[PDB]
Amino acid sequence: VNRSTALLKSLSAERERWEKTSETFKNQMSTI
């Protein structure tokens, strides 16, 4: 299941990227 664990951690990093994108987009939605 090591391949699955690697996919899981890569997708968690992707989720962190999604969170930061959502945070900056909420900043823009607040300042609009």
Side-chain angles (χ1 to χ4, degrees):
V1 305
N2 187 236
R3 208 263 196 284
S4 306
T5 312
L7 304 173
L8 211 166
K9 54 200 295 299
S10 288
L11 196 86
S12 300
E14 198 240 341
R15 166 159 188 72
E16 280 303 317
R17 175 222 82 91
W18 279 87
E19 295 160 76
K20 72 102 183 172
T21 319
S22 62
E23 168 79 8
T24 188
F25 252 66
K26 295 305 109 174
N27 156 11
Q28 284 133 1
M29 191 274 258
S30 173
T31 179
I32 187 188

